[PDB]
């Protein structure tokens, strides 16, 4: 009847903790500050883009398991501080009709019984499960040697050539977006770009290989994505888009002769490459 | 039961998946919900 | 999606996910019913509190996924929005009152094993299936649980969710709440007395709630997520949208040209 059970309990914060000494409340807001801090930051480590790859997954459950679980505790705890928190008000009420205050709703009302004790315990386990990721990846890339991530020299001569072909399609893109007949299927490849391609202004990094790999068929891809529905014939050779070589607004004359090479390029092309395409439409 | 020259096609053969209906394949959690409509018989 | 599991690709071909451009940043879920119409939670376009209308241009839905980190060139089909419907009667201000939304993608898709639109509840399958006790089926790629660590989102599994919720009836729904309930929304989930549990999650909205008729082995989208206070807490329940009891309005949009 008033029993219950859910003992999901995998945190590292031992139970005879919360019976220490609480931490005096001004001293307190902020540690609570520095927690969440730690879990705003060991999330990211898995949002990493780096790691969104098939071998990486029975090592990010372990971190996330890690995360979740230190976390419920914090819930629990706060789940449970609320329930003495009302009492404590109703008892507060019986003493003042003046009831010029308000009851704090569960998702106003903040932890306020926190010994230290806790505090460095759940940290010790977060800053743990996290050096303790980061060697369940170094170890899954001394086995799988295109995740290795790349130098900063050949880092950059990838991203490089993604770039280029990349910009190779904006050339594609502009080509046609003013092309009313196919105005459309150019937006959606441009946004399709842009969508593998990254938030404009911090894009994907391309560590490893496979990731180069990948971007370059998944672009190569969208491009003749572009052409299956225009029906239109991918050239075998599109020039590149240099934001200061022809800018649409910068460099309209190079702009304008940029498209006007490329729309050529599509009118003169032969229906050899759909032959080879990486994906196999049909 | 809309005309597919407003709601487009598919609705004809709406529901089934491709890759488990038309094909006789039950998915890891189907009879499950078959559980919850008759608890007896 | 709570107490969520890893789908089986190619389990809810009708799945969309209601993505964001820029900053690229997923939105909810979201249902296809043809092969121009997907169906989502009125709110994941539009609701004011939280400085949010979002428009045609702002956003793309992607059907036909699984992994909701990489693109998947050879299912993956992206596409953009014509014109977006979302219900008049549509009550923010206070309750999530009709909280539902059509969208009409700018070009027909073409359905392939794993974009496969998905039935809507029957005047009659409506009945014999929408009844408490039943339980009936949501997908999302919504917070993998509830989090004391507000402030934060990215929360989220990596390949798409699916838990099987079974509906509660009225008096429990409107009970559990301090929300004002209406027929135009029903509440699914697990009783505290029982024993499990689950349920779907911020940023999972859109999504649908399907149910199976045995009556001919197809699926139909009775509701979509709508809201709940909190996620898979303890008394309280998750709330979808009635979308048969909606079906009216839909109809009333899609069949527009005409009259
Ligand atoms: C739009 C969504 O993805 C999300 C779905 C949440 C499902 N939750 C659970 N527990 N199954 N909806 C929301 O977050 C909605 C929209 C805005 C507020 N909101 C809530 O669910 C609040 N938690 C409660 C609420 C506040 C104001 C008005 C209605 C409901
Ligand atoms: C944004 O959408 C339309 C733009 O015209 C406007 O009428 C509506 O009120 C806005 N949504 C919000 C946040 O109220
Ligand atoms: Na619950």
């Not at chain 2, 039961?1 to 487009?8: A, C, L, Q, V, W």
Request: charge should be neutral.
């Amino acid at each position: 009847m008033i029993v219950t059970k859910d003992y999901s309990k995998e945190s590292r914060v031992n139970e005879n903790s919360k019976y220490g000494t609480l931490i005096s409340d001004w001293y307190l807001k902020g540690r609570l500050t520095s927690l969440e801090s730690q879990f705003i930051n060991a999330l990211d480590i898995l949002e990493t883009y780096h790691y969104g790859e098939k071998e990486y997954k029975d090592a990010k459950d372990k971190l996330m398991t890690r995360i979740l679980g230190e976390d419920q505790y914090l819930l629990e705890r706060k789940k449970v501080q609320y329930e003495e928190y009302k009492k404590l008000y109703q008892k507060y009420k019986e003493e003042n009709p003046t009831s010029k205050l308000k009851l704090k709703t569960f998702d106003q009302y903040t932890i306020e019984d926190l010994t230290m004790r806790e505090y460095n315990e759940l940290t010790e386990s977060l800053k743990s499960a996290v050096k303790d990721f980061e060697k369940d990846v170094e170890k899954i890339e001394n086995q799988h040697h295109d995740l290795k991530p790349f130098t900063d020299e050949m880092e950059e001569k990838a991203t490089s050539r993604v770039d280029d072909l990349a910009n190779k399609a904006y050339s594609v893109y502009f080509a046609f977006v003013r092309d009313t007949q196919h105005k459309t299927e150019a937006l959606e490849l441009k946004a399709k770009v842009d969508l593998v391609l990254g938030d404009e202004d911090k894009p994907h990094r391309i560590s490893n290989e496979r990731i180069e790999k990948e971007m370059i068929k998944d672009l190569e891809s969208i491009i003749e994505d572009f052409f299956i529905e225009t029906g239109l014939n991918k050239p075998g050779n599109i020039t590149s888009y240099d934001s200061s070589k022809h800018h649409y607004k910068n460099h309209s004359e190079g702009f304008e002769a940029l498209v006007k090479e490329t729309r050529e390029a599509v009118a003169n092309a032969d229906e050899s490459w759909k032959t080879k395409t990486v994906k196999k439409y049909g | 039961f809309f005309n597919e020259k407003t709601f487009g096609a598919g609705e004809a053969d709406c529901g089934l998946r491709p890759l488990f209906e038309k094909k006789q394949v039950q998915d890891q959690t189907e009879k499950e919900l078959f559980e919850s409509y008759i608890e007896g018989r | 999606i709570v107490e969520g599991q890893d789908a089986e690709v190619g389990l809810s071909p009708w799945q969309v996910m209601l993505f964001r451009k820029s900053p690229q940043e997923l939105l909810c879920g979201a249902s296809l019913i043809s092969d121009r119409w997907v169906l989502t939670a009125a709110h994941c376009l539009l609701y004011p509190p939280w400085d949010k209308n979002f428009t045609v241009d702002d956003l793309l839905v992607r059907i036909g996924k699984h992994s909701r980190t990489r693109y998947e060139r050879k299912v993956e089909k992206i596409s953009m929005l014509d014109k977006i419907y979302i219900h008049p009667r549509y009550n923010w201000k206070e309750n999530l009152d009709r909280d539902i939304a059509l969208l009409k993608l700018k070009r027909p898709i073409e359905l392939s094993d794993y974009i496969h639109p998905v039935c809507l509840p029957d005047k009659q399958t409506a009945a014999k299936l929408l009844h408490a006790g039943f339980k009936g089926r949501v997908t999302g790629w919504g917070n993998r649980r509830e989090t004391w660590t507000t402030s934060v989102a990215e929360v989220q599994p990596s390949v798409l969710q699916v838990v099987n919720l079974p509906l509660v009836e009225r008096p429990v729904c409107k009970a559990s709440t301090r929300i004002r309930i209406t027929d135009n929304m029903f509440c699914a989930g697990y009783k505290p007395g029982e024993g499990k549990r689950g349920d779907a999650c911020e940023g999972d909205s859109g999504g649908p709630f399907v149910m199976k008729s045995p009556y001919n082995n197809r699926w139909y989208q009775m509701g979509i997520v709508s809201w709940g206070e909190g996620c898979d807490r303890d008394g309280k329940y998750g709330f979808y949208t009635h979308v048969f009891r909606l079906k009216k309005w839909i109809q009333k949009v899609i069949d527009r040209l005409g009259s």
